[PDB]
Each structure stands twice: as structure tokens, then as C-alpha cells.
Amino acid sequence: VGAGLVPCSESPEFIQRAASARNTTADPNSGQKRFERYAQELCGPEGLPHLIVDGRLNHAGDFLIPSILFLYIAGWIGWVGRAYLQEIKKRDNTELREVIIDVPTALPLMLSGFTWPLAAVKELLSGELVAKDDEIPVSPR
Amino acid sequence: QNYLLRYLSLGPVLLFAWLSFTAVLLIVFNYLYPDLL
Amino acid sequence: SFEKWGQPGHFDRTLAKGPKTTTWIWNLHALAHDFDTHTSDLEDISRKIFAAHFGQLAVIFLWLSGMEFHGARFSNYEAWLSDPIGIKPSAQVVWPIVGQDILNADVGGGFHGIQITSGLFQVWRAAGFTNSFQLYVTAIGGLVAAALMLFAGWFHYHKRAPKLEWFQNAESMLNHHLAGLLGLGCLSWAGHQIHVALPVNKLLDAGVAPKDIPLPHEFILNNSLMAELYPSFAKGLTPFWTLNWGQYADFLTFKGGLNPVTGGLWLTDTAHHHLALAVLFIVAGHMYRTNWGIGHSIKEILENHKGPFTGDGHKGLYENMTTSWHAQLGTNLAMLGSLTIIVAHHMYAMPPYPYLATDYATALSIFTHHMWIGGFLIVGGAAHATIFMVRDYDPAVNQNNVLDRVIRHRDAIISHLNWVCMFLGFHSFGLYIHNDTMQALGRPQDMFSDTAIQLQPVFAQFVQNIHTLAPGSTAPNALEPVSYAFGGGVVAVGGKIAMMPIALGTADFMIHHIHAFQIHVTVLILLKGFLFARNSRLIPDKANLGFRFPCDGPGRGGTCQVSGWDHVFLGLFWMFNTIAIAVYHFSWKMQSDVWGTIDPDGTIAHITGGNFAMSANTINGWLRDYQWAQAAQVIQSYGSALSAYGLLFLGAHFVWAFSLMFLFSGRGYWQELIESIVWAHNKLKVAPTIQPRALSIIQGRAVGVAHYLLGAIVTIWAFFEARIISVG
Amino acid sequence: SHSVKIYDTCIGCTQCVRACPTDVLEMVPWDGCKAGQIAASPRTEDCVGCKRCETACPTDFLSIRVYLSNAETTRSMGLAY
Amino acid sequence: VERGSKVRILRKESYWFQDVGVVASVDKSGIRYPVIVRFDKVNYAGVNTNNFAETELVEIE
Amino acid sequence: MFLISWRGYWQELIETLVWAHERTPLASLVRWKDKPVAMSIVQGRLVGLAHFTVGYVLTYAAFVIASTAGKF
Amino acid sequence: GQTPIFGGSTGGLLTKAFREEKYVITWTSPKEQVFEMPTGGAAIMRQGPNKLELARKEYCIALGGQQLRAKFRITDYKIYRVYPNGEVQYLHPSDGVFPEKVNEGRQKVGYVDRNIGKNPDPAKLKFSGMTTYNA
Amino acid sequence: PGDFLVHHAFALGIHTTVLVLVKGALDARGSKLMPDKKDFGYAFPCDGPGRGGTCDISAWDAFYLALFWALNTV
Amino acid sequence: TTQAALYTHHQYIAVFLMVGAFAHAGIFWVRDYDAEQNKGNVLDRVLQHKEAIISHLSWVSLFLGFHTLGLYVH
Ligand SMILES: CC1=C(C/C=C(\C)CCC[C@H](C)CCC[C@H](C)CCCC(C)C)C(=O)c2ccccc2C1=O
Ligand code: SF4
Ligand code: SF4
């Protein structure tokens, strides 16, 4: 947290901005409150805070858990999409329904993405995620 | 009848539906507690 | 009865089966309306056209009534009523959430929102609108009429549809429309004007308690107040029974000029105008032959006009004008476009509404809007002319006619045309850059303005002059000149100019000449595609093959871009240039020597200071002395309450470059990249069944030109919108 | 002019010979498949480069190809002047 | 590998190389390319049907 | 200009423009060293790219040296 | 000697088409009807002989293919190339109605019946100027 | 922070530049939908509109694109 | 001014100097190359897996572009 960066608590220009900090929304405490919420980080001569990313508990949670949340949701959406696609093909109405979504079937697949990570891990160990270099017949060259 | 969904489920109309749902979703959390950082 | 929509491809037999690849999607949005490509029958076509017209009218009514309703409940009209100067109209109040809270356009009286510029209140300063409830009823009427005529379309298509001979009575068409539609509507509106408009206008001179001013019911049968003013307007004295009209000199007069108490002209002139037009084209529209065995046999008139150079004249033209549709479409589009642009070129010297020249924001917005639409659709008129040429013609009914006589000697025409274009082009632009070099070369005596080598457009000056002293002799029963840009006195109000005479010096010359230049080349491209549509000196199968196709292989070298709509592509690029520099010229002059402020001496202190006589002669000056002013605030025009609208000018450049990306590149490259991504997806068992395929080259060209135009026009409207906000 | 290239996949539908407007093809007697007469180019000198022919070839990996040469002339360039 | 069996392709230049199609009609005549196979994946204009020499085909199952 | 427009349009008008010399008098004396035709495709691409690159080079150099010698 | 009824145009014969080559076409049309010419024009033919002069090997074949046999069914038209000296060539018709596939034995000059999988190579075929065929 | 930003921009720039270049290089022999080009040469080949068109496939079409992508980077 | 002009001068010289290298690599791939003489050596093992290379390269380009532009517009 070095590099010549003053704490946002005691950076004079920080509170200087905080004084007439333009309260954005329809509540008078909007601006001031957020500046109060910006005492944990450490400002600089620009008067605005920089973010440190190291796992260092000074700013660890301020970047780690959002990353993990994104991984959660991206895994969910990718998993349910792939599962839906795999399911459609066992109907022999393939491209008919490619544009007409079968809602009574599209729902439970979406609702059943609860345990995507570890299940995916299983498909990794079972090897249920990849087809074989030559079995996949998509010809290169 | 209820056959309307048979003719409302097209994808495109469903696209905008889902997207607007997710949009107001994102709004309410940004509308109820946009004060957590 | 809902079992029918979700059966796509209902109109085409080919794409009805199934979506093999993504291509099936694209054509779905491409052939949904050209039902001439569905059968050979015509009654069905006509019925579809009727229903579509009804639907368009319905959306018209809907949007106008909704805009009213916004004007009633969320617009500071009735507060801006008492003061149209110290208040700037607005609407569309901002919703108080994160992101749009600082954008409260406060225009006095605490009314926040969005400071609009469309001048509907100006109509609402002439219609005499007091309370918003009547306006509420107006919106209700508009929307119910919309729904009504939509239901009418449904009925006239599904239950009782018209027959086929109901089409081609152009005679009764012209008669009914010309007379009944135009004359009756115009005379009805004039009657509304005289009864209500000018009365409340009178009553808007000194603060005469607007809502307290009576309602029309207090004047339907109450002639007392109607007898207050206009003594002849007791009842009317009804001297029309006695054929005497001298009594009516009260309201039905002829002034012809600016009324410095209304911000516009004298409304009585407009009323008598509308009267005269009404009866004039009523007796006009009573011309052609119909069901009483009396009238012109119009298909014989065109038979008569022939002669030595004519060949055989205008023989055989009605099969074209009624059997085919695209013909009519194209011609009417061209005419409407021209008409619209003259309208634009018209209503900045004769403001027909109250508070127009005094309101320096709505003027150029309306002007540029209409001007853009004009060209933007006349090119489409020409395109439909070409599509007629490829779709509809006849070798039999077109022997030696004035039509065929050009398609036989096209080469001379177009060669001389190219000649003219080259001549004008460099004769103007190279002259310009010559003067540019001279100024950059310390040889200023070789410049071309008044202070240097001379040239003066005497013709415009003399025509304006002979227009200056018109009344008295040419116009005895007329009081003031038609406008004040030709001649007369500098008419104004407050410290704010309304109209002054316009000066034409040296810089006018090359500007008008390059206008003509670009128009010439535009005609060149379009007419070239027109004539060389069916047969070229190398491609004798064009009409035998179509008019929307990319190329004909690398024969004869290259042949790509040999259809016609690519001709209109190039043409629309060029007309973009034309109209862009046209609006540049108009805005700069009417902000340089027409508009500004005024002192008690009538001293017009213009905005810029007459910059054409100083810099509008060399290129480097044209960028300096125009866009320095046109942007020096947009950089900082954001950052407060009534500034926060960070405009998407910063944003439009991106779409412009993204546009030009599509133009310069082929498609096989994208196809191969697609195939590689497909390989990867197939390796991870996520291969989309519907196999993606890259765009077709014509599709890519279309999206490229679309994005190009969009970015450019967005950029420019952002420019002058913010520029007017800096002064209005 | 340019060079023409023939293969074995000629099924013999003969849509190319009816497509080339330049008289550079003929079905010479063959034996292999049911065709018995396979297309070939006897009169290359009038080749044009339109290559409307293989667009008329339905065979998978269309049986005819044209190697677009470099020895062009007034005939191969096709000028009326 | 009979009429109605799924087999992959040995012809190299083939657009559906290694791809599986169904033997629609087993011809066995004097032509060098007896076997008629049908696919559904589209090359140029959908030539999902083609012929080969069955010395260029291998089954899967 | 060189990049966008392609060689399927710049040949039709060369035809009619050849048509001129053949039929005007007092100038039909002279004839052709060699029969002129439109450009080639690859050459068109090349010249367009060359124009683009030369346009890009000059302005930036002028800007940088002028700025450095005018601001210090 | 029969030529159709036309009023003159501006895209006919040029300085090459009488210093290098001439093209002519003629058939037998027992009727008279309106037709279109590729240089532009809608005119009428005459009974029997129908002689026409032109400069390109495309207008003629376009007339012969699409107009005569596909619309008017006429199939007895000669198409003749002409040298500068005034002498003529008879390329086609060479098979009667240009069917382009029927004969009892045909010409034989040049053959290449080979697939593409084994193609000519740069580094193997070198120091000479032969093409993609000789293996 | 700015240096962080622009340096990642440089990374991107060279990444796409080498992308298009190696694509053209490894297609100097042939593509999946046009494998023959090895014999057509480092030359014009256009292969007229077989499927929507095949313009700009000629093994240094990539060179133009790469030149643009290098100019903006520098 | 002197050192500045020299710096941009030399870097500009440098940029498409490399493009020359890549272009001549491409043209080498068509003219100067024999198959059997290099059967199974390292070059062929590169060609056998070019696919994953170009795919991951496209991947990193897309990633960096998306995210840098997103942060900018943020
Ligand atoms: C303009 C243009 C042409 C036409 C260009 C031509 C005909 C060449 C221009 C003629 C010469 C180069 C003009 C220069 C003549 C000089 C004035 C003579 C030189 C003599 C001096 C040195 C004294 C194409 O052929 C073309 C082809 C493919 C894509 C785009 C285009 C394209 O954009
Ligand atoms: S190349 Fe095509 S048209 Fe010619 S014989 Fe073979 S299959 Fe028939
Ligand atoms: S371009 Fe094609 S159709 Fe024309 S002559 Fe050559 S091979 Fe025959």
C-alpha cells in the first residue's frame, strides 16, 4: 500500500471534496455517506482512491469476492446453456425448436443449475466433458 | 385461449422479455441499496 | 382466432420449411413486404397497400395524441403562456433515480425536465390554447380515431374488400382529392382561424386574462363581441347576398409583411390566402372527365403533342402509369422530396407562426430536419424509377416515344454530362485551392474577394433589386414587400433580429457553383445507373439477370459493383456531401450576418461578426473559423445541472470507424475465422446446430453504409444542437 | 487464353456446357461412370473469366476448374473497340 | 455397413471427411463410386448426398 | 476513394469516353500509342494502401516537430 | 438480304470491328414480331431471311440462345466470324442445334483424367515453364 | 493508473497484429473452404462468388489488414 | 525536438520492418518448402496444432479488448 499514497481518512483534499460532495440521488446524505464509506481505502495527491490487489487483507475482499461472484454466475449460465443444447438434440426436431424455445422444458434446466461447479468436477474426473481428437470429425486443413 | 403463448413464444419477444426482467432486476438492487461499497 | 401467427414464412414457399443456417433469419426481414414477388395478381396487392396505409395513419394519430398528452401534464405551457420570452418551453420531466437526477432542465418557475426544441407551443400560441383538459380530450379523439380507422382497415380487408376496376379512375381520384380534400379542409381551417385564432390573438396583445377570455361557444351565436370589432362583422352584414365585398375590409385584408407585435406575419393575410387557394384549386380540380359525359379524354391530350423533333410525342404512357406501381411511387417521391426541400428553403424568410424569427432555436432544427428528409427520399424516388426500369417496361408499346428516344442516344448525353461535371468541378475547386496557395504564399493580391481580383454575381443582385420596389406598380393593392431579405427595412423586435436584407458579395459565387457541381455529379451517377440498367456495352444480360446482384465474376478484369443500387450507394454518399455543406453554409451565414443582438439604435451586433468576407475563401480558414466556434463549448458543455447531457458526439465517432471497417474488408477471412471458432466449440461439445455463416457482401456493404450515415448525421446534429443551446 | 482444368467427378448432367456462353466445352466419349461422355475444353482461346460454368456444376467439389492465366489479349479481354 | 448404417468417410478432399452419414442406397455396379451416402450438414448448396467407393468408408458401431 | 469504389464502374464510362475521340473532328488526327483500359484490382488495392500510408505519415510528423519546437 | 426495321442508334460498329473482325447472324423467321437487341432497341423482324451485323461474340450468342430457340423456337441460324480481309469463319452451329452433348464418336486432342490430391509442386517442378498437368 | 491502461492497450495491439499475420502465414498453403490456393500462388486469387463471395483470400489480403493494425498501434 | 523526431522516426522504421519479416515468412511457406524432407520434425508438429494457437490468441485478444473498453466506458 506504498507508492506514496495517503490514507483516504486523513487526506485533506479528500474531505475538502467531501464537504460540498454533490449528493447524487434523492437523499441528502447520499454524497457524504459515500465519502464516509471511502475512509477504508488510501487516497493520493489526486484525492481519489487507488485499489490494491494482492490478497493482502488491507484490500483483499475489495476485489476477491466480486471475482468469485462473477465466476459463480458465469459458470451457471454457461452450464445451463450447454445442458439445454445437449438436451435439445434428443428430440429429432432440432432446428425447428432452435428458434422456438420449449418453455416447459427450458425452465427446469435453468432452475437446476444449483450445483454446477462440483458436478462439473465430476464430469471432469469421469471425463464427460471432452470428445476425442479424432472422434470429433471437424476436418482442419 | 391459452394458445397465445404458443404464438407469443418466438424467441425475439422472449429475448426482450428476459432482458428487461434482468434489467429491472439490476435496477432494484441499485434502487434499494446503492450505498454499499 | 389466434392459431396463425407463429407459422413463419407464411408468405414465401422457400423459407417456410426451416432454418438450415443463419441465412434463413436474414431473408426473413428482407422479403416481408415486396408482395409483387409473391404472385401475379393485383387486387391482393392493392388491398395490402390500403391496409398498410391505414396502419401508418394509425401510428401517426397515436404518436401525435401521445405527444399532446405529454404536452398537457408534463410541459410548462400554461406558465409559458403569459410569457413566451422569459420562459423556455420544455417537456419530458426527468425520472429521479441514479443517473438521471442532475438533468433537471429548469426553465423558470421551478419547472424542471427537458428543454425541448420543436416549437409545438408556437402552434399552441396560434391555436389559442388555454387549459390542458381540452388538450386531453384532443389526444383521446386522436387515439380513438386511430383505433377506428385501424378497425376499418381490418374490415375492408377481411370482410368487404374493394374490387379491381375500383383502382384506375385517376380522373375521379384527382377531382375528389384536389377539390374535396384540399379545398374543403383548407376553407374549414380558415373558418376556424377567423372565428377563434385572430380574436384570441387580439386578446394576446396586453395580458387580457387568457382563461377569462370566453370560449368559442360564447361566439357561436353571440355576435355582440363579434360586433365589437369589425363593424361589418355584425352578423356579416351578409353583403355577399348583394355581391358587395367592400364592407369586409376589416379582417379579410392584404398586408404582406412582418407584424412586430406577433413575432410572425399578419395572420389576416394567411386567412385570405387560404380562402383564395381553396376556391382556386376547387375550380381547378373540377376539370377532368367523369360519369356525366363531359371532360378531357386525357389519354388523347398526350397523343396530340408531337412534331419534327418529338418523333411521335407522348404516345402510350398510361399503361406505365396505371399497370405498374413503382413508376408512380418514384415520380411522387421525387416531387415530394423537391417540394420538401423548397419548404425548408422557404420558411426562414416568411415565418408563418407567432414567435418564430424571435425564437432562434426551433428555426434551423426544423429547417435541417426537413432538408435532410427531402434528399434522403428523392434518392429513393430515383431508385424506384430504376426498379421500374428493371421490373416494368415493354418493347411493343414503346416505339419511338419520347421515352425510347433517349435510350437510343444515351452515350452522347452522358458523355457531355461527364464533360460538364469535370469542367465545373475543377473550375471551382482548383480555383479555390489556387487562392489557398496564394494566401499561403505571401501573394495576397492574387486573392479573389472584393479586396482583390474581382467577380460579382450581378444577376442575383439585379433580380433582388427588381424585387425590392415591387409594390405600388406590380403590387398596387399591396403594402410591404413580400420579404425583407431582398429589400425594405430591417424588421426586428427587442434586442433581437427578425429579418434584415442579405448581402451577396464574392464568396457566394464559388459556393453556389460547387452546389451546382455536386448536384451535377449526383445526377450523373443516378442517371447513369438509370440508362445503363438493362444493357451495358459489355453486360447484355443485366435486366436478364436482375438489379440486386454483386458481380459477374472476374471477367474482363473486374466487374464487381455493376448493379444499379450500388450506383445509388455512391449517389447517396454524394448527396450526403451536398446537403452537409449546404447546411454548413446556411447556418454560418444566418449566424454571421443575419442573427445576433440589437441596440436601441437598431444596431445589429451579429453573433460572429461577418466572417465570410474574412475567411470563407481558403480551406484552412474554413476549419478554423467554423468548428472552433462549433465545438469550443461541447468539450466543457457538461458538468452541472442544466448541462449534464454528455452528448454522444464523443460516441458517434466510434460507430463511424466501426462502419468503415465493414467497407474495406472482404468476407472469406471472416468465414475462415468463423470455421476456427466452430472447431473449438465442437471440441467442447457446444456446437450450435444452426451453422453460422458470414454475411453476404451486399449485406455487409449495406450495414457499412448504414452505420456510416448514422454516425455522421448523429455527429452533426449534436454539433449544432449544442451550438444553439450556447446562444438560445 | 486462360487455362481450363478437368477432373473425374463429372457426373454428366451437362449444366456447364449449357451455361458457358463462350463455346469452350464439349462432352468427349468416356467409359468410367454412367456418363459415357465427359466434359472438356477444346477451345480455350475464347475463355472469358466469367466462370459461370462451375456454378452450374452440381458435383461435390465441382468437377471443372479454371486456372486464370496471365496471357490476355483483345479476345480474352473482350472489347468491342 | 449396409443400407441404413452410419459410416465415416476416408476420401481426403471430402467436405465431410471423417464425418458420419447413412448409406441410403447400396449400389455395387461397375462404377468406381458405388456407395450412395446421405448427410445433413451442408457444404456448397447442400450436397449432403454423395457417392464414394466403399473402399473409402468405415463404420462406427 | 481508391479503396471503396471498385473496378466494375470505372470501365463503363471509359467506353463512352473512347467513343468521343473517334467522332469529333479536328482532333481525330492523333491515335493511341496503346489502347487504354481501367486499372487492375490488385494494383487498385496497392495504390489505395500507398495513398493511405503516405497520408498518415506526413501529418503526424509535421504535428510532432512543430509542437516540440513551438512549446519547448 | 433482309435486315429488321430500326431507327438507328449510337452503339454499333467501331474502329476495330472493320479493322480486325466482323460478326454476322441469320436465320429463317416465317413471322414478324417485336424483339430486343443487346445494344438496345425494340424492333420487328420479317418473313424468312433475317440478316444482322454485329461486333461482339456475346450479343449474337445471347440472341441465339435466349431469343430464338427459347422464345421463337427458330433454330436455323448461322453465326459467322469475319476476318479483316473479308473472309469468314464457320465456328458454329457445329452440332445442328448446339445440343453440346450428342455425337457418334468425338474429337480427341489433349486429356487429363486425374484427381487433385496429388498436385504439382513448386520445389519439385522447377527450372522450366510447364504447367499443372504434366506429371 | 494510466500507464496500466495504455500498456494493456499495447498488449492488445500487438496481439491482434500477430494474430492476423500468423493467420495469413498459416493460410499461405490453403484453407478449409479453399485448400487449393497453394498452387494458385502468392497472387490474386479471388474465387468468384461461390458462397456469398470469397474476395480477399489471397494470402496478403492479411498484409493490408496487418499494416492498418500496425499503424494504429505505433 | 531532435531526439523526439529521432525516436519516432526509428520506431516507425521499425514497425513495418517486422511486417516485412512476417510477409517473407509467408511467401517462404509457398515457394520454399518440401514435405517429405521434414516429415515428422518440429515444423510439422507445429502445423499439427496451429488450431489451438490461433483460437487461444483470438481468445486473449477478445478478452483484453472487451475489458479495457469496459473499464474505459465505466
Ligand atoms: C479512380 C479509379 C480507377 C481509374 C484510374 C485510372 C484510370 C488511372 C488514372 C489515370 C492516370 C493515373 C492519371 C495520371 C495522368 C498524369 C497527369 C500524366 C502524367 C504525366 C506527367 C508526369 C507530366 C480504376 O481503374 C479503379 C480500379 C479498381 C478500383 C478502384 C479504381 C478507382 O478508384
Ligand atoms: S462438370 Fe458439371 S455440368 Fe459438366 S458434365 Fe460434369 S456434372 Fe455435368
Ligand atoms: S469463364 Fe467459365 S464459362 Fe466462361 S469461357 Fe471460361 S470456363 Fe467457360
Residue numbers in the entry:
A (entry chain O): 24 to 164
B (entry chain Q): 8 to 44
C (entry chain E): 25 to 752
D (entry chain H): 1 to 81
E (entry chain W): 2 to 62
F (entry chain G): 665 to 736
G (entry chain N): 7 to 141
H (entry chain G): 517 to 590
Task: Copy the relevant paper text.
Photosystem I (PSI) is one of two photosystems involved in oxygenic photosynthesis. PSI of cyanobacteria exists in monomeric, trimeric, and tetrameric forms, in contrast to the strictly monomeric form of PSI in plants and algae. PSI includes the pair of associated chlorophylls that excite electron leaves, known as the special pair, P700, and between 96 and 112 antenna chlorophyll a (Chl a) molecules (Jordan et al., 2001; El-Mohsnawy et al., 2010) that function to increase the optical cross-section for excitation with a subsequent high-efficiency energy transfer to the special pair. Upon photoexcitation, photo-oxidized PSI transfers an electron from primary electron donor P700+ (a special pair of Chl a/a′ molecules) via its internal electron acceptors (A0, A1, FX, FA, and FB) to the terminal primarily ferredoxin (but also flavodoxin) under iron-deprived conditions.
In this study, the structure of tetrameric PSI from TS-821, a thermophilic non-heterocyst-forming cyanobacterium, was solved by cryo-EM with a resolution of 3.72 Å and has an organization of a dimer-of-dimers. The tetramer exhibits two types of interfaces: A–B (between monomer A and B) and B–A′ (between monomer B and A′). Therefore, the structure is pseudotetrameric and has C2 and not C4 symmetry. The obtained cryo-EM structure of the tetrameric PSI of TS-821 resolves 44 subunits: four each of PsaA, PsaB, PsaC, PsaD, PsaE, PsaF, PsaI, PsaJ, PsaK, PsaL, and PsaM. The inner cavity is surrounded by four PsaL, two PsaM, and two PsaI subunits. There are a total of 358 Chl a molecules in the tetramer, 91 in monomer A, 89 in monomer B, 90 in monomer A′, and 88 in monomer B′. Interestingly, only the A–B and A′–B′ interfaces are conserved in contacts and packing to the three identical interfaces found in the trimeric PSI. For interface A–B, the contribution from Coulombic and van der Waals interactions is 0.1 kcal/mol and −16 kcal/mol, respectively. These results indicate that the structure of the dimer-of-dimers is mainly stabilized by the dispersion interactions (London forces). In the tetramer, only the lumenal face of PsaL at the A–B interface has multiple bulky (mostly non-polar and aromatic) residues, while the stromal face has polar residues.
